[PDB]
RNA sequence: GGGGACGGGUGAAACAGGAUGAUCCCGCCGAGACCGCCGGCCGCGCAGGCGCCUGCCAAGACCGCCUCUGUCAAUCAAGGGCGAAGGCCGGGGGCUAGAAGGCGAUCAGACACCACCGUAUUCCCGGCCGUAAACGGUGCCGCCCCGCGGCCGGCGCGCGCGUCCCGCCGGCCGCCCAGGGAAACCGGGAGGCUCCGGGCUCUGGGGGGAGUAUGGCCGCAAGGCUGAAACUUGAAGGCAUU
RNA sequence: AAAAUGGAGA
């Protein structure tokens, strides 16, 4: 196994073309794009990206409006708790 | 029946400011500084500076009806200095020779609960 | 089709006729199929609700803010973009808003918006790569692809035109009050070049 | 500490029926002592179990969270959304009150 | 040619410490190499204590007593004469000299 | 504003780094007994009447 | 700090050789 | 002794000004805090509004005449919530121990205990009471330093949180000001903590209001002169 | 919101702040770091390292024991796992300091020192780097010691019961007796050793050249890791006395 | 505040 030793395996599908910076950046983003994250309600890692932004989990049969390349984009993940902070403070 | 207001006095390595204000401090009785009296940059925060700045304005606070004052001496504080400035106590001395009367004195130095990076580099200042 | 940003269909009970009216909202990240967005003056700050910006507290993350009251959606709609209420000032019933670009503007408190960042973030980080991804991307937008640079075109067409050696021929900075045909270079540049990053 | 310890204590000595449907059947006849439901419970189970529990007086309290985590707590890889406890092996101190 | 056994530090059973910067130098110094003299001083100067005490509008008032730590850097300490380099015999004397139990920043 | 008469209760020490200055401990000859060290140049002896002062300037004993 | 300003000088000498060795070949 | 601006012209910016009397809650027997100035209303500013929401600092000695030993350390910040009869009526906002006493508490040879507790006032003013205490040497301890054992320190942090919970868990701000002014609660903490281990200066460094409810009109009346109904 | 001309900065000065009202004085707030005094011949940990409050998870060492196991032991090439800062690779973040870069002010130059900005960085996540005066400049596991005191961990000892004493101590140590050392000094060793032989890994052989050249390996790169010679020339160095 | 040299070889 380990057919291509270099870590550029998902993006080995490109070959010699497209530079060395773009191929590496793509490897991280592409792997995140097809990754199975865990849908909140299903709590099972069955989610994929239907199209950029909307992701759905086969088991939970629910569509979560997540990020383009990951179920939970890093900035929103924080905003989540900041709304919770203001709200818990309000009452 | 009496009246008192807080002095909120500040000391400085560059220049001291004496800003007698009232209760909350939102409303300012009088503002004075040592630069406004002297004419040399080094003596703007000097020991003579404060003594000259008070008393010149003490009359305006007496006219404004605040005979009694509460001195809250403040050194630069925060990241640097911590201790009082050169011309700090001098200001109280000149106003105390004047009729102003002090009920309580407090330190308002903005001491920090785990401070931000101290200014200057790791070698400090190689003057 | 055109907007990378997700569009979310949400239906509300119509106040008059029994049938429910369906309204399309720019999707805020965290919206789930079956989420009940409670929307109104007394609606909470849970992510997804539509409420008067003045009632929203300071520092909140907001998307789809309205420029003037009841403009039905105006600022902060782009993928991954957000606005922050710096302060709900009551001095003139005007809430401060920090726009995604970072200017400081103000909106009447009666403006309304959705708490939560617009979904679809990180869209431009991935290189488009193959130009074909660009032909397909702009296949849902304007016919603005592919672009031909000014020094390439023959002189009868572009002001930058072409000399013997493909030289712009003059300075790109062109005044703000120039005739429509003239403004082809950088419009009214206040400082050209790359300086101390972009932060001062 | 005690709540997690109780979960391991129930797995070795107590009778634990994992799974939502089994819980309903146990509660209906009144063969129920406690119900621990994870946060990722569908709202319908949360409302329907609340009605069912109120009639049978069966005390129910939420788990710390993650149906997957309740699964890890009862020693099972499979997710457990709600775990009925019958004949608790060694005390029910965890139940609120 | 090791100068001091302590090596200017009290570090025992340790490897690294926190850094506190000199009030004068601004030089970062590990807690171990910093002078750390603790000083207690009255907020007003002693000279005008009498007139301010004379203005005792509130009953039984006392002077504001300030508790602070002074931590000069090694180079800051010698030039501001907080401490003085001493001989081999004087090196082990573990006490500050000139008695002075008097309570003020200036020893007076 | 008038130079205040003072009583040189005692002479302290010679300083200023050239020994020229001789700061002395003083008391008010006219006043509510204010007494403070003042900076003096030239020869001074105890019980001298110094009528050349504005009073506000204050000197110190550290040297 | 002569040692630092010798070592890093040596590194600058080492780098010069690399370009000279490859470009010439 | 009377409003300064009413009779005295004052400086050109201060030529138009006002002076309104501020009155403390009944718990501070010296109700008068003095007079605070504002602009006479010209329609730009409501004279009442600036007075309605401003916080004025009063040390316990000024707030009530009493022993200096228990007055200088305790500072009370009072924020008004209502303006009646052209007078500022103050309401509880916060307390602070002066940097003087907090500095005195710090000593080498002991490790401080600091615990932050949250109190849900029956009134709706979530109040955060911060408690500090210190260690002191045993009377006949052979060693000079009294650093407590870890087991006691874990117990100490738990101990201070309890008692604070019993005394303040179910008490309104009218009860609270009296329990902080009397120092009765600070003492109650000392009795329970003292048995566990020797500890010194078991005082609340500061208590500040995280959130107070809208419409504290009833409280303002209760604080100002309704002591007749409650103790 | 108030009020009223200066404010910054220093070794003096100036660079940029400010009647669109600065500095200042209070309230209200928004992020981002940081956890103050307490804070130590304290403690912890394989070391690098370790300091907000609440909890939660897996431990570690320790001492005590009429608890089994029964030599399972020591040091260890090859092989791994970590490893401060800075650096790098993509994101996120950006409060202060601030490599660069700009200024002013210094000096015959000021490239700098110093003021004032300020980007990378610093903070977090996912990887690479794999080095430091990483130092106790002292590898590890053993044994025998010369006394006097601390600090921390248990655990006993009698005592009018007091953190009282006194040991067992495991670790933190200070001074030091012989002994050793070119000395400085060490002496819970750097001693027991020219009367020179517990065990076991590592390293050195005049000062340069040289960590260079050349191969291999590693890293994305920076760099790491391994590692000669040709030639030079008489000292280089160590601790101490005036 | 500045503040730079000191030929060789007894």
Automatic annotation (TrEMBL), chain B:
Organism per entry: Giardia intestinalis (strain ATCC 50803 / WB clone C6) (Giardia lamblia)
GO CC annotation: cytosolic small ribosomal subunit
Biased composition (Basic residues): 116-127
Protein name, per record: Ribosomal protein S14
Entry annotated with the keyword Ribonucleoprotein: yes
Keyword presence, Ribosomal protein: yes
Region annotation (Disordered) ranges: 106-127
Top-rank taxon, per record: Eukaryota
Molecular function (Gene Ontology), one example: structural constituent of ribosome
TrEMBL record, chain E:
Residues that coordinate or bind Zn(2+) 2: 22, 24
Gene3D superfamilies for the chain: Ribosomal protein S26e
Gene Ontology CC entries for this record: cytosolic small ribosomal subunit
Keyword set includes Ribonucleoprotein: yes
Top-level taxon: Eukaryota
GO BP terms, alphabetized: translation
Family membership: Belongs to the eukaryotic ribosomal protein eS26 family.
UniProt feature, compositional bias: Basic residues: 94-108
Name used for this protein in its record: 40S ribosomal protein S26
InterPro entries cross-referenced by the UniProt entry: Ribosomal_eS26, Ribosomal_eS26_sf
Gene Ontology molecular-function annotations: mRNA binding; structural constituent of ribosome
Cysteines joined through disulfide linkages: 22-25, 22-76, 25-73, 25-76, 73-76
Residues holding Zn(2+) 1: 22
Signal peptide bounds: none
Region entry Disordered, spans: 86-108
Keywords: Metal-binding, Ribonucleoprotein, Ribosomal protein, Zinc
A family per Pfam: Ribosomal_S26e
TrEMBL record, chain F:
Record InterPro entries: NA-bd_OB-fold, Ribosomal_eS28, Ribosomal_eS28_CS
Sorted UniProt keywords: Ribonucleoprotein, Ribosomal protein
UniProt GO MF annotations: structural constituent of ribosome
Cellular-component GO terms for this entry: cytosolic small ribosomal subunit
Domain of life: Eukaryota
PROSITE patterns, alphabetized: RIBOSOMAL_S28E
Signal peptide extent: none
BP-aspect Gene Ontology terms: maturation of SSU-rRNA; ribosomal small subunit assembly; translation
Similarity comment: Belongs to the eukaryotic ribosomal protein eS28 family.
PANTHER family: 40S RIBOSOMAL PROTEIN S28, SMALL RIBOSOMAL SUBUNIT PROTEIN ES28
Name recorded for this polypeptide: Ribosomal protein S28
Organism: Giardia intestinalis (strain ATCC 50803 / WB clone C6) (Giardia lamblia)
UniProtKB/TrEMBL annotation, chain G:
A biological process term (GO) from this entry: translation
Coiled coil: none
Keywords: Ribonucleoprotein, Ribosomal protein
GO MF annotations, alphabetized: structural constituent of ribosome
Keyword set includes Ribosomal protein: yes
Source domain of life: Eukaryota
Gene Ontology CC annotations of this record: ribonucleoprotein complex; ribosome
Subunit structure: Component of the large ribosomal subunit.
Family, as annotated: Belongs to the eukaryotic ribosomal protein eS32 family.
Designated name of the protein: 60S ribosomal protein L41
Covered range of the whole protein: 17 to 41 of 41
């Amino acid at each position: 196994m380990a057919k291509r030793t270099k870590k550029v395996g998902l993006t080995g599908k490109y070959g010699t073309r497209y530079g060395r910076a773009a191929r590496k950046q793509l490897l991280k983003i592409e792997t995140s794009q097809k990754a199975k994250y865990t849908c909140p309600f299903c709590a099972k890692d069955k989610v994929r990206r239907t199209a950029c932004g909307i992701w759905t989990c086969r088991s939970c049969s629910k569509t979560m409006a997540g990020g383009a390349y990951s179920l939970h984009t890093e900035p929103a993940n924080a905003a989540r708790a900041t709304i919770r902070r203001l709200r818990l403070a309000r009452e | 029946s009496e009246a008192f207001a807080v002095c909120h006095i500040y000391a400085g390595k560059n220049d001291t400011f004496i800003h007698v204000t009232d209760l909350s401090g939102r409303e300012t009785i009088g503002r004075v500084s040592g630069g406004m009296k002297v004419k040399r940059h080094c003596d703007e925060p000097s020991a003579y500076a404060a003594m000259q700045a008070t008393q010149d304005l003490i009359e305006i606070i007496t006219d404004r009806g605040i005979t009694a004052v509460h001195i809250k001496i403040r050194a630069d504080g925060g990241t640097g200095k911590r201790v009082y400035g050169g011309g700090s106590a001098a200001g109280i001395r000149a106003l105390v020779r004047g009729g102003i009367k002090i009920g309580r004195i407090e330190d308002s130095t903005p001491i920090p609960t785990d401070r931000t990076r101290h200014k200057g580099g790791r070698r400090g200042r190689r003057l | 089709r055109g907007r990378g940003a997700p569009l979310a269909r949400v239906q509300f009970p119509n106040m008059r006729g029994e049938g429910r009216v369906n309204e399309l909202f720019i999707a805020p990240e965290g919206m789930y199929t079956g989420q009940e967005v409670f929307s109104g003056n007394k609606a909470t700050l849970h992510i997804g609700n539509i409420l008067p910006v003045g009632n929203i507290p300071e520092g909140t993350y907001v998307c789809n803010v309205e420029e003037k009251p009841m403009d039905r959606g105006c600022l902060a709609r782009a993928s991954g973009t957000y606005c922050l209420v710096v302060a709900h000032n009551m001095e003139t019933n005007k809430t401060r808003i920090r726009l995604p670009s970072g200017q400081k503007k103000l909106i009447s408190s009666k403006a309304r918006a959705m708490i939560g960042l617009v979904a679809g973030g990180g869209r431009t980080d991935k290189p488009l790569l193959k130009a074909g991804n660009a032909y397909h991307k702009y296949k849902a937008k304007r016919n603005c692809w592919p672009v031909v640079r000014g020094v390439a075109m023959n002189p009868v067409d572009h002001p930058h035109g072409g000399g013997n050696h493909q030289h712009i021929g003059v300075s790109s900075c062109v005044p703000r009050n120039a005739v429509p045909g003239q403004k082809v270079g950088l419009i009214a540049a206040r400082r050209t070049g790359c300086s101390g990053g972009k932060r001062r | 500490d005690s709540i997690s310890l109780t979960l391991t204590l129930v797995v070795k000595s107590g009778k634990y029926t994992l799974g939502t449907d089994q819980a309903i059947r146990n509660i209906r006849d009144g063969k129920a002592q406690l119900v621990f439901m994870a946060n990722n419970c569908p709202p319908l189970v949360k409302s329907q179990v609340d009605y069912l529990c109120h009639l049978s007086k069966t005390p129910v309290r939420v788990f710390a969270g993650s149906s997957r985590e309740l699964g890890i707590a009862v020693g099972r890889q499979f997710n457990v959304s709600i775990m009925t406890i019958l004949e608790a092996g060694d005390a029910d101190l965890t139940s609120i009150l | 040619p090791v100068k001091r056994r302590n090596n200017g530090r009290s570090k025992y059973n340790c490897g690294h410490t926190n850094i506190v910067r000199c009030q004068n130098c601004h030089r970062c110094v590990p807690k171990d190499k910093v002078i750390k003299r603790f000083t207690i001083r009255n907020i007003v100067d002693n000279t005008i204590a009498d007139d301010v005490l004379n203005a005792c509008v509130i009953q039984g008032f006392a002077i504001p007593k300030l508790y602070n730590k002074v931590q000069y850097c090694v180079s800051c300490s010698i030039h501001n004469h907080i401490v003085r380099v001493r001989s081999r015999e004087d090196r082990k004397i573990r006490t500050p000299p000139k008695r002075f139990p008097r309570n003020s920043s200036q020893k007076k | 504003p008038e130079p205040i008469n003072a009583r040189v209760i005692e002479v302290l020490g010679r300083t200023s780094s050239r020994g020229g200055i001789t700061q002395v401990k003083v008391e008010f000859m006219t006043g509510e007994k204010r007494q403070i060290i003042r900076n003096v140049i030239g020869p001074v002896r105890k019980d001298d009447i110094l009528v050349l002062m504005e009073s506000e300037r204050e000197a110190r004993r550290l040297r | 700090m002569r040692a630092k300003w010798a070592k890093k000088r040596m590194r600058k000498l080492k780098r010069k050789r690399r370009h000279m060795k490859a470009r010439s070949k | 002794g009377k409003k300064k601006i009413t009779q005295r012209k004052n400086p050109d910016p201060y030529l138009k000004k006002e002076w309104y009397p501020v009155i403390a809650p009944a718990h501070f027997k010296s109700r008068h805090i003095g007079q605070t100035p504002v602009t006479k209303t010209a329609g730009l500013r409501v004279a009442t509004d600036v007075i309605n929401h401003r916080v004025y600092e009063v040390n316990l000695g000024d707030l009530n005449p009493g022993a200096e030993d228990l007055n200088g350390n305790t500072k009370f910040y009072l924020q008004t919530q209502l303006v009646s009869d052209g007078k500022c009526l103050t309401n509880f906002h916060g307390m602070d121990i002066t940097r003087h006493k907090y500095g005195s508490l710090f000593r080498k040879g002991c490790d401080c205990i600091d615990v932050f507790m949250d109190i849900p006032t029956t009134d709706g003013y979530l109040l955060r009471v911060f408690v500090i205490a210190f260690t002191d040497r045993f009377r006949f301890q052979r060693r000079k330093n009294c650093h407590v054992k870890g087991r006691v320190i874990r117990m100490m942090r738990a101990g201070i949180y309890e008692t604070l919970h019993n005394e303040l868990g179910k008490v309104s701000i009218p009860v609270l000001v009296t329990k902080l002014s009397n120092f009765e609660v600070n003492a109650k903490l000392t009795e329970a903590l003292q048995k566990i281990t020797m500890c010194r200066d078991v005082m609340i460094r500061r208590v500040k209001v995280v959130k107070r409810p809208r419409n504290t009109m009833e409280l303002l009346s209760t604080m100002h002169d309704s002591n007749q109904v409650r103790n």
